[PDB]
Design a protein around this ligand. Structure first.
Ligand code: FES
Ligand code: FES
Lengths: 206, 206
């Protein structure tokens, strides 16, 4: 009867919600970048995922109508916030919509499962490769140059997420640059050899 | 019009499906235990999750109508296999059903996110504690003695999943037994101090 695509101006640094917040809205990334993290008892930040354009945020909060995690813009971002009730209401009416919602949640499970394997079996070189490959192909997927993209998150955040040093991360980028596999200019990454990167990415060797 | 709860006798050791298999059916655990794993390029097993009674299996396969992972019974198990089409068809008709399906997938994301934090921030003592606590409360949740439960998976599989040695795992159980926090008899675990375990579980300290 009346669809609305009201978009919202989320500046860098600010939270979509907090860990404990009641699930009012799910948030759809129309543009920009969100990170999801949690704070440990000891008080440290641990990032559990990164969200890009197209991605929906808060799936982990449905079960208990409560956000178990923080979200935060890593840059200026545009969001469409949906009251869950409305969503489920509309996806009950619309097949190819929920079929997509299922598909999107499905994909977040697949991802975390991959992230679990990564943290289990993969070495530092493999993790960064797997990370850059993933980023790269979600861009290419969404519609971007599969070879040039910008790292929106810090190198710190990448290390946090992959369980690696900022030192380590920058050394690795040097290696990838030295091999011509990759071109790095500040936050911009150019892939010159997707093959080689994919190899490195999907290894998991001792 | 016609609901069917046809159940299936899955013996220990056999696969529900393989990595690459086309999503014909989702599988609902009426009884028993399933593990989901993947095989690395190098050929090793890495478990990404454990499924119990109540849990649905194959959510990670919806996005691409393809199973990205293996499943396998860890013991004799009873399953209800659902053609995805039917599921989505019925959940389009039935609100509180999909509302549950969303809830169940939501919960698998939350879990893996936790599993990600675990593998990132938690030490060996914390991981096992977090693992036993989780198991414990899913039992209590489903309806079981929140204090006595059986480890259906091997100690090997637990180590695989938590990135710990079988040696390490058995030493830890000794510690937990020594402190009276826990009672261990073969595969049977008795929780004597949920508090202490929960503490250990939800720590994530250096
Ligand atoms: S307006 Fe279509 S996704 Fe934000
Ligand atoms: S029969 Fe109800 S879940 Fe298997």
């Amino acid at each position: 009867d009346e669809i609305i695509e009201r978009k919202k101006p989320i500046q860098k640094g600010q939270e979509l919600f907090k860990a404990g917040d009641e699930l009012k809205c799910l948030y759809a990334i129309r543009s920009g970048t969100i990170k999801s993290y949690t704070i440990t008892e000891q008080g440290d930040e641990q990032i559990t995922a990164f969200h890009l354009a197209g991605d929906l945020v808060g799936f982990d909060a449905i079960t208990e109508a409560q956000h178990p995690s923080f979200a935060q813009a890593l840059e200026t971002s545009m969001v469409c916030e949906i009251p869950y009730e409305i969503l489920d209401d509309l996806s009950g009416k619309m097949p190819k919509l929920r079929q997509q919602i299922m598909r999107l949640m499905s994909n977040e499970i697949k991802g975390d499962q991959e992230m679990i394997l990564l943290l289990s079996k993969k070495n530092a070189e493999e993790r960064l490769a797997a990370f850059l490959y993933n980023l790269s192909t979600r861009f290419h997927q969404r519609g971007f140059s599969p070879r040039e993209f910008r790292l929106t998150m810090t190198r710190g955040d990448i290390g946090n997420y992959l369980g690696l040093t900022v030192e380590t991360i920058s050394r690795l980028l040097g290696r990838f640059q030295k091999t011509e596999m990759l071109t790095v200019k500040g936050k911009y990454i150019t892939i010159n050899d997707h093959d080689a990167l994919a190899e490195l990415a999907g290894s998991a060797k001792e």
